[PDB]
Amino acid sequence: SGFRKMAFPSGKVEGCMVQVTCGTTTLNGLWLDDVVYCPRHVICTSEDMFNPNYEDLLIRKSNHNFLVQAGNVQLRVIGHSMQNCVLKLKVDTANPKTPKYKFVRIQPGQTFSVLACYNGSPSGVYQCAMRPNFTIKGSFLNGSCGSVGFNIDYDCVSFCYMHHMVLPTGVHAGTDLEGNFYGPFVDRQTAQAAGTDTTITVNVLAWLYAAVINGDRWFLNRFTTTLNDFNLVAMKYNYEPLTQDHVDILGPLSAQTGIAVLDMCASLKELLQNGMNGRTILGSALLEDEFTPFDVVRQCSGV
Amino acid sequence: SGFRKMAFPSGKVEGCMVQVTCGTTTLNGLWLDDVVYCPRHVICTSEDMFNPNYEDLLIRKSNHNFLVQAGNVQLRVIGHSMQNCVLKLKVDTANPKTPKYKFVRIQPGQTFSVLACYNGSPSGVYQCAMRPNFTIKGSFLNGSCGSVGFNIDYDCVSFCYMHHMVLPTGVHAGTDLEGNFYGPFVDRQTAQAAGTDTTITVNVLAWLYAAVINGDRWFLNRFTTTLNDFNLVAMKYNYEPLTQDHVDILGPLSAQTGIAVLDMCASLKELLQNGMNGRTILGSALLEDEFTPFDVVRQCS
Ligand SMILES: *[C@@](O)(CO)[C@H](C[C@@H]1CCNC1=O)NC(=O)[C@H](CC(C)C)NC(=O)c1cc2c(OC)cccc2[nH]1
Ligand SMILES: *[C@@](O)(CO)[C@H](C[C@@H]1CCNC1=O)NC(=O)[C@H](CC(C)C)NC(=O)c1cc2c(OC)cccc2[nH]1
Ligand SMILES: [Cl-]
């Protein structure tokens, strides 16, 4: 009963967050086994940040140049390497609270939980989606760098995002835990624009099924559409094309509600062409696209 | 800003969640020091649930009828009592993960994080607002009662909600950690209707202050009002009347922007009587009422 933007419980990640300081720069790090992972621009200065030759700046640093603090305990750095935009600080102590984990690179349209952290301390947790243009619409303030995004499957934490940047438009950019940015961004102190964003169509459809499962059907109609005719209209409105894989992934929700996927597409088509007028869906005046089919299934199955 | 619903990190509460079973009835409990708190209806059999006599059901129970488990590890129950709609089970082990905590009863409009749990295992965390009609718009499946709502201040967890009921309309109802329901509801297997809901005025005002902090201030007018005058008008638009506490918790935002609370109230009054006239505030044509003055500062600071 009910439907809400839900994040995974953050405890397993809270126990990995530490504070990393180099010179006058302080941000968050992720302590897994005997390594602390953080954004490499912590080794920058105020001047370096506009065009940093990271390899050149890193060689000039010593292990003792890195102050790592887990609570009221200082961790001794005994090694340091760089993997793309991620600094890897070897410490003399394995984190005793390390969970079962892996590093994964998430795909656009997929969701993850963000643990926002400042000075190594967790501050809040919320759910985000990888936008088609590889930005995320996060909530990050000064000092949030090194905050991580993750999913949980059973006891396994899959880390997928580390936070680096805010764009002039207010959306955010970061890397996976191998230090590769999502999108065309670069960890230099410059104003960067993203590619034109699109709406995550399969997620909007999942969310419409959620609204039906929660007893709201005002947007349904008797009509049906072909996949291609739907995609022509969606593309006109800057919606991502719906693939057959997307159609299949929506199977369960379609079965649960007995509304054919292409039947829901006809409803979305009508919503795009006419608008919602004054009405709302699941409390929103806008078409929500940051719930995946799985998000909806986990909250609405058997409901 | 980028105003999202943001929950508190849930780890301190995860370490307190257990499952409690009586017969085949299982739900969640909260293990703090050597006490486990849980909804008293765990002692009901499927059939008792329509109009239980809890005092009578409970006199027929002994400590050894209660199965409390942290994961798969049983915690022996050595004492039991009922306090309103909550059962308190004394166990022989003090929870080593017990945080600093208090039990607080919140006012309508206040927000809190809900850690949804099933069979003692946390599954998700999200932010809720206590509606003026004492419901919350949660996301709760079978097996969710005993899940708790909380705030975190410094290192201290303030527990404010324990889940008990879903209403016919799909909203949710529950108690504080002393077992006292929010609103007129009771822990019975019966359809219970919530009063008509109203908009949380104090939070709308917080949201307007947030808009002003962000340079979005077209709606400010050069008027002020009395609190009485505003309340009388607000009620005609199904808005909650403001209290002195509401005026007080808006103080920091009023000082930050230099706009007196009653001046902001006159601006809201004009929006109510005239509408948005096809404009948006913070990007939305809807006025948001689920961010408290604290949430605003917190997300902006
Ligand atoms: C990290 O905390 C830095 O350690 C920080 C996160 C942002 C601060 C405000 N909100 C955030 O998400 N990241 C930065 O400050 C990065 C640092 C780079 C990678 C060296 N830079 C930016 O986010 C950045 C720079 C510029 C800019 O130039 C100058 C112009 C416009 C936007 C912009 N963002
Ligand atoms: C707890 O998990 C029970 O342990 C459960 C929470 C709901 C399950 C689905 N979503 C929830 O939020 N609570 C209940 O089942 C309670 C049990 C009472 C306290 C004995 N009852 C209800 O939620 C309930 C019963 C009825 C009803 O009857 C008749 C008619 C309409 C609504 C309704 N809700
Ligand atoms: Cl039910």
Numbering used by the authors:
A (entry chain A): 1 to 303
B (entry chain B): 1 to 301
Please share excerpts from the published article on this structure.
The SARS-CoV-2 main protease (Mpro) is essential for viral replication and is a primary target for COVID-19 antivirals. Direct-acting antivirals such as nirmatrelvir, the active component of Paxlovid, target the Mpro active site to block viral polyprotein cleavage and thus replication. Residue 166 of Mpro, although highly evolutionarily conserved in coronaviruses, is proposed to be one of the critical sites for drug resistance in SARS-CoV-2 Mpro, with E166 variants showing the largest decreases in potency against nirmatrelvir. We determined the cocrystal structures of SARS-CoV-2 Mpro E166A, E166V, and E166V/L50F variants in complex with PF-00835231 to sub-1.9 Å resolution.
E166A/L50F and E166V/L50F variants demonstrated 10- and 950-fold potency loss, respectively. When L50F was added to E166V, the double-mutant variant E166V/L50F had increased catalytic activity which was boosted by 185% relative to its single-mutant variant and from just 6% to 11% of WT. L50F has been reported to co-occur with E166 mutations to possibly compensate for the loss in enzymatic activity and therefore has been suggested as a background mutation that can accelerate resistance selection. In each of our determined structures, PF-00835231 was bound in the expected conformation with strong electron density observed for the covalent bond between Cys145 and the carbonyl of the hydroxymethyl ketone warhead of the inhibitor. In complex with PF-00835231 or nirmatrelvir, Glu166 makes three key hydrogen bonds to form the S1 subsite: between Glu166:OE2 and Ser1:OG, between Glu166:OE1 and Ser1:N, and between Glu166:OE1 and the nitrogen of the γ-lactam ring. However, in each of the inhibitor-bound Glu166 variant structures presented here, all three of these hydrogen bond interactions that define the S1 pocket are absent. Our structures of E166A, E166V, and E166V/L50F Mpro variants demonstrate two N-terminus hydrogen bonds absent in the WT complex: between Ser1:OG hydrogen and Phe140:O and between Ser1:OG hydrogen and the nitrogen atom of the γ-lactam ring. The N-terminus of E166V/L50F was well-resolved in an atypical position, folded away from the active site. In the E166V and E166V/L50F variant structures, water molecules are positioned to substitute for the OE1 atom of Glu166, facilitating interactions with Phe140 and the inhibitor. The most resistant E166V and E166V/L50F had a Tm increase of a modest 3°C–4°C when nirmatrelvir-bound.
